[PDB]
């Protein structure tokens, strides 16, 4: 992660070596030092009462490579998430060597595509890339216009609520056109 | 698909055409004038 | 085994893998359906209904037996610019019993090819045939003489790339494959020069390796061996190998016979290696001559090893190639093989190895009059081996120290492809082929790296797109 007028060099020096090179227009970024100049916003909004609360499913805190730590409850948690590097090489190596073989991405600007190629060089497959929201229904009549693009953006909707009642019935249709290539084993 | 199978049945078309060649079959030891030769088959086709 | 690894790279087979039907492109100009006019043919209408629907129009081009090498040229000049011609002159046509190579379709196709060459038309030619070449041993060849057209077409593909399009084989009797495929086949960008339309799809000629696991089955020369043209080098080394293996009797037969340059030395060598060998000066073209030759074979020994090797050849250039020319050039091959087969229905032959060449296996400039004979041997082996008669159409390459196989085209191909096989390994290749009862082995020393530089250059093809090493 580099400042403005720096990503240009970061991709110019990268395209000459014939490897993955991308740059984003986002003004903020995480796991790289920017929060080093702000220390009055990450440790001043905690007033947690001295009484117990319940929890939920465990999470894997990737802030120190293949960190076995589930979470860091320190006041510098946001700091290390925004400043300390994830060290994603070790993290994605541990993900691939175990069963974690689908990268269900949530943003349209992933920072693990390099990790995707790294895993492709080694063991592990099915490294996914799921996109964000592409609008959605206008209403129930303006329904279809942009919900067709919302479905076609990785966001599955509920189609039994679409046709809950419209006078629609089952119709035989051509199935999946299995793209066929010869895979034969000879004795 | 089942509709194509009905198209096959309705017009009385036989699917028995011949042996496959995509599978890398030898096809040359598969037959012999001697019916008892080991390695040889008897039918000269079949729907495949 | 380790020494038979050379034989495995020697023996090959022709297999018809299912290719594509071709990319259908809207044709223009005209597409002439060249055929005869003696009988009304529904194949004409079946071909046409998808031809004017392909964008062009259809014009009937009637051609008779030896009508002339020029008539079709001014006919095509009169119709105008043509994008291609369908040769429906080889549809449901019986083989004239006078000579397999006297087939009228072969002469008409050669005349049409030379007319298009002389008419400055430059359109691909497609020859429609009815089960002329087997798509596989499962089905059957109706006419081996029609395979001579396929062989001469493979040769023509290496002479006039623009004028020649290829051949399109269809099932005998059925015309649905024409209506289903011809439009995409003739205009296909795939580049297939060998089309075999069938009910299960479309099949293209392919070169595929023949595995040699060294089957325990051994073929022995027991009985008398009838070697046509035994004095000729090809049959010479075959007879020598038979005598070495322990052939009881040898019956080397050729028109020259004892009057051949090397007959006495070969006979002495056979007598030294084997025993009771005989050479005779008998014609093989005449049916009655072969009949009385077999009648004169001593009843003390049955005949089971007819090895047809006789082959006459002067030139194979297409500009002079006409049907009767091939006929009297390779009569000693075709007619002789037909007479031997017709005489050997009632003989329990353990081997009827028809000695053919690579001229039918792939295109061969200067062998255009020689290739039809080898293709007829291929088809005859197909027909015979299909029935209760073992057959083996080995397509030999350049033969070391052998007449007819050696010639100007031999050295030309030696400098742009195959070379003389060692007899010491060609004999083992033939032994292995007889061990499997292989229908049509293709025993070549082809050097794919250098041979394909002159084969696929003028005409890219998928005929060699099945050999793993042919990519290089």
TrEMBL record, chain A:
<comment type="function">
    <text>Involved in the biosynthesis of antibiotic erythromycin via the biosynthesis of its aglycone precursor, 6-deoxyerythronolide B (6-dEB).</text>
</comment>
<protein>
    <recommendedName>
        <fullName>6-deoxyerythronolide-B synthase</fullName>
    </recommendedName>
</protein>
<comment type="subunit">
    <text>Homodimer. Erythronolide synthase is composed of EryAI, EryAII and EryAIII multimodular (2 modules) polypeptides each coding for a functional synthase subunit which participates in 2 of the six FAS-like elongation steps required for formation of the polyketide. Module 1, 2, 3, 4, 5, and 6 participating in biosynthesis steps 1, 2, 3, 4, 5, and 6, respectively.</text>
</comment>
């Amino acid at each position: 992660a580099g400042d403005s007028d720096e990503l240009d060099r970061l991709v110019a020096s990268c395209t000459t070596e014939c490897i993955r090179a991308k740059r984003l227009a986002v003004d903020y970024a995480s796991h790289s030092s920017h929060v080093e100049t702000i220390r009055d916003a990450l440790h001043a909004e905690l007033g947690e009462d001295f009484h117990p609360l319940p929890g939920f499913v465990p999470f894997f805190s990737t802030v120190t490579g293949r960190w076995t730590q589930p979470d860091e409850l320190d006041a510098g948690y946001w700091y290390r998430n925004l400043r300390r590097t994830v060290r994603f090489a070790d993290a994605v190596r541990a993900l691939a060597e175990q069963g974690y073989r689908t990268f269900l991405e949530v943003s349209a600007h992933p920072i693990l595509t390099a990790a995707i190629e790294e895993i492709g060089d080694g063991s592990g497959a099915d490294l996914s890339a799921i996109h964000s929201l592409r609008r959605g229904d206008g209403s129930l009549a303006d329904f279809g216009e942009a919900l067709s693009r919302a479905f076609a953006a990785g966001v599955a909707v509920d189609w039994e609520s679409v046709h809950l009642g419209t006078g629609a019935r089952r119709v035989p249709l051509p199935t999946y056109p299995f793209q066929r290539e010869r895979v034969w084993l000879e004795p | 698909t089942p509709e194509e199978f009905w198209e096959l049945l309705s017009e009385g078309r036989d699917a028995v055409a011949g042996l496959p060649t995509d599978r890398g079959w030898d096809l040359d030891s598969l037959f012999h004038p001697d019916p008892t030769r080991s390695g040889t088959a008897h039918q000269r086709g079949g729907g495949f | 085994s380790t020494e038979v690894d050379e034989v495995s790279a020697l023996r090959y087979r022709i297999e018809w893998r299912p290719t594509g039907a071709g990319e259908p492109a809207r044709l223009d100009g005209t597409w002439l359906v060249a055929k005869y006019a003696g009988t009304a043919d529904e194949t004409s209408t079946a071909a046409r209904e998808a031809l004017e629907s392909a964008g062009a129009r259809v014009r009937e081009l009637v051609v008779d037996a030896r009508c002339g090498r020029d008539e079709l040229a001014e006919r095509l000049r009169s119709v105008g610019e043509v994008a291609g011609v369908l040769s429906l002159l080889a549809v449901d046509e019986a083989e004239p019993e006078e000579a397999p190579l006297a087939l009228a379709s072969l002469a008409d196709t050669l005349s049409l090819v030379q007319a298009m060459v002389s008419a400055e038309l430059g359109c691909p030619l497609w020859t429609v045939t009815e089960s002329a070449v087997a798509t596989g041993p499962f089905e059957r060849v109706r006419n081996a003489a029609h395979g001579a057209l396929w062989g001469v077409g493979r040769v023509i593909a290496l002479e006039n790339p623009a004028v020649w399009g290829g051949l399109v084989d269809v099932p005998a009797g059925s015309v649905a494959e024409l209506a289903r495929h011809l439009a995409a086949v003739v205009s296909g960008g795939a580049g297939e020069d060998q089309l075999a339309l069938r009910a299960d799809g479309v099949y293209g000629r392919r070169w595929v390796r023949a595995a040699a696991p060294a089957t325990d089955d051994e073929w022995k020369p027991t009985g008398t061996v009838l070697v046509t043209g035994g004095t000729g080098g090809v049959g010479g080394q075959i007879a020598r190998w038979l005598a070495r293996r322990g052939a009881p009797h040898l019956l080397l037969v050729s028109r020259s016979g004892p009057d051949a340059d090397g007959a006495g030395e070969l006979v002495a060598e056979l007598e030294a290696l084997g025993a009771r060998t005989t050479v005779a000066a008998c014609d093989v073209t005449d049916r009655e001559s072969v009949r009385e030759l077999l009648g004169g074979i001593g009843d003390d020994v049955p005949l089971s090893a007819v090895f047809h090797a006789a082959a006459t050849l002067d030139d194979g250039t297409v500009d002079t190639l006409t049907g009767e020319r091939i006929e009297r050039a390779s009569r000693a091959k075709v007619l002789g093989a037909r007479n031997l087969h017709e005489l050997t229905r009632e003989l329990d032959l353990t081997a009827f190895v028809l000695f053919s060449s690579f001229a039918s296996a792939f295109g061969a400039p200067g062998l255009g009059g020689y290739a039809p004979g080898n293709a007829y041997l291929d088809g005859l082996a197909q027909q015979r081996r299909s029935d209760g008669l073992p057959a083996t159409a080995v397509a030999w390459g350049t033969w070391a120290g052998s007449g007819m196989a050696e010639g100007p085209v031999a050295d030309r191909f030696r400098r742009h492809g195959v070379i003389e096989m060692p007899p010491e390994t060609a004999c083992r290749a033939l032994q292995n082929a007889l061990d499997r009862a292989e229908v049509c082995p293709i025993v070549i020393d082809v050097r794919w790296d250098r041979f394909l530089l002159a084969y696929t250059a003028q005409r890219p093809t998928r005929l060699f797109d099945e050999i793993d090493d042919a990519r290089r």
